[PDB]
Symmetry: C3
Subunit: 307 residues, 3 copies
Amino acid sequence: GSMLELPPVASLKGKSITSAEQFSRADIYALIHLASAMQRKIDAGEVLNLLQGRIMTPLFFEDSSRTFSSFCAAMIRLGGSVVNFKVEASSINKGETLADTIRTLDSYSDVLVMRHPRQDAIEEALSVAQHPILNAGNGAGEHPTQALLDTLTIHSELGSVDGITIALIGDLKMGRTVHSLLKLLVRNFSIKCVFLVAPDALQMPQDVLEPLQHEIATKGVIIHRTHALTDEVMQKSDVLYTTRLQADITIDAARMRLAKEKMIVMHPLPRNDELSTTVDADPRAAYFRQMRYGMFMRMAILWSVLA
Amino acid sequence: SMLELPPVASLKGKSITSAEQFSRADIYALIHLASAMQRKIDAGEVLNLLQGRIMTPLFFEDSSRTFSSFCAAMIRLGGSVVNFKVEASSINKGETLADTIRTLDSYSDVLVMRHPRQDAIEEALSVAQHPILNAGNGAGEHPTQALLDTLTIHSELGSVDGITIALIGDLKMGRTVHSLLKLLVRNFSIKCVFLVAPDALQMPQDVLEPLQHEIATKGVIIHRTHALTDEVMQKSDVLYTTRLQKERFDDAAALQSFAAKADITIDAARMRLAKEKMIVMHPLPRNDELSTTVDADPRAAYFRQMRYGMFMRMAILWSVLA
Amino acid sequence: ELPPVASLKGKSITSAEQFSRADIYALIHLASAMQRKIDAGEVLNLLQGRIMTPLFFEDSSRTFSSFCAAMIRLGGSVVNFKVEASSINKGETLADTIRTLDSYSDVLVMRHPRQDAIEEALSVAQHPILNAGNGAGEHPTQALLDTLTIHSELGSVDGITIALIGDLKMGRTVHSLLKLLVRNFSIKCVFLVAPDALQMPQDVLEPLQHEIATKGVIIHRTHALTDEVMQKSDVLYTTRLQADITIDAARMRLAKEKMIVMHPLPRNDELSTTVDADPRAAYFRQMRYGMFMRMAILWSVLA
């Protein structure tokens, strides 16, 4: 896509990303279009130099394969650079506080990408940092860029987000990904139906559902709770989005015989047994492609924040 | 550009081991270069001076500032970093330090080394062909900390000559204060140094004795205290404090440290006695010796200090590798 | 300039068996060309915007660092993935980990303690994988750089007498080197110097038996560095065991003038530091040849 422009999404300039709530529908589509243009240029072999001389520092206080690697790769493919700071090798072992660690990396960097097991640690970091912080996961709170890349996956695979029926399956209580995704979808799209598929003990929290209650009612979004992947959930869902425990909810090839032809199976990953390897060969299995869409969404995000 | 960012010629191709190796002219040249680096980077300019050159960090101790600032400085000059980790290396298979140095020296343009043995730097120099920069050698030295500390004093106060500085905390084990005292006394006309520490953690004789000539020649006043007395607070232009390395605490250091701890803590209450214009510095990391109540004070320079460190390390890397 | 070796384009590197003599010389000439340019201070931009991800499930100093340095010196970039800080801790399978890094990267460099792990990785990855060591199997790029070292230091590879010394049973470097040399060169003699319990495996020797016979390669086993091995060998290639076989200055008094000592490293006491100052000690130079061979390989794969 040599003649394609890469206009940054202006609303994101210089801003930290903490919640799916911060995005408008217009922002999301602008990011989607920007991510697709990124994908076309990169896949054609174009070299981008947009962020030369800019530094991202990862601040991962919990493990990560996709989010860490995707953000590093995205920065590099924009022409930016990464300082490979490791918490386990740092002055935190001599009692340095979180706030002083943030100030330290903020001294050298243009953007910080932070994942932390405490839900309020992001707000603490924002209180002392001069540069933008991107929330890569805050305890069982949110994972806002996962929601963005999930929505890019749905859009790219199915062609439309408005009108879908989506099942959110698994550990909904502790699942930061489904918290952000439900917020992003309900606030900004005309979703037909959401199945919330989980054991009662792991159901979607009231602190996610209640803020959405007014929009759910006014937009007429149907919310249906189940504790199993019933035939109804299988037959009606355009998207099955499943998650790992942080029940009769396993997705395997046998279960997929009930699914419609035009639908996708998604999973933020990593997975355990809830999503069988028997599904991997199915054209409807989108969870590996989902990871690559993440890299391009993170390119669109980084360029928009730092342009 | 040779107008804007001339390298400090004296540093070309040379290892940096000690604050002793620098002259006054070298230090001012680095200071002016670091200020030019800051100007350019803060204006958004992208530098390509070190494209194709590689720095490899070789950290055998933890670090937040020194590792990250060297990496960032290398990147901001257009160079690159090989992220070698000691814990994932052939050291686990019995590879010697010397062979490890030879290995990384095979691929790199500069090595940045921190090691818990004071003599490890010399051992590495004995086999490396490329420059090694000492990022801290046991309780010996931290020469680039001293350079960035001096940039900080110069930039914040306007002058290094004539200052009264208190060095506070674990002076015995503090590689940063060893290098800073050497750099300052050898190359500037310091008015007075307060050495503020429990007796067991005082500044070592191996640091003070070689400096006695410069101290006499320049008439530097040296006073030991075990407290931030009203006199230290009223007279100091720079309070440079450090963390007690309590993980090293025969029982005298622990007991004397505890006895002195409140007297050597800087907090908002103690700052009421400080000069209107002065700075508080700390190489970091800090623990409770430097209270968060001081962080909002304009005199708190220890966060700015870290950014000055990045620019000083750009000045250093560019001068070594130009 | 720097023409890539066309036969390597887009291919994974798994075994010394996959290379022809023409491939090896092309890689040697390209690596020497890159050395000339890099040593002259020239900056290469051949792989700007391309990413290598190292995936090391075993320790490494040379292979990891040399691959990263090689990628960087071609203008490429590295995503610094660590097994210990990854989702493997949450039960992620090797297959899924490969799929994950394959989503972001242009090339994966993989070392793993299981011999069959590289094949498993190949079965799911779309981008090339370079085998940086697969259990006690092979280490194909070590063999390539070893051969560059012999060429550059001695001038001919055909016609040499080479001793392979140490733990030949478990040594993936000697497995690959024996394959690469016997398949593609006319070697005069190989001394296999090892305790009986650690001798070169039959699963390495038997596939080579036809080549050995048709090229008339002499194969001798010893359990010690005898005077004959020391006097006749053009290359002493020694390895770490994971008295009779130690190389030190005393033993070097028996070596010919025109020979080299090599060691893939790391070493323990089997190669004394007393040898290090000898002009014949090539094992440090060998590491630098490795960086340039890896530049030649990465460029040829990704061109």
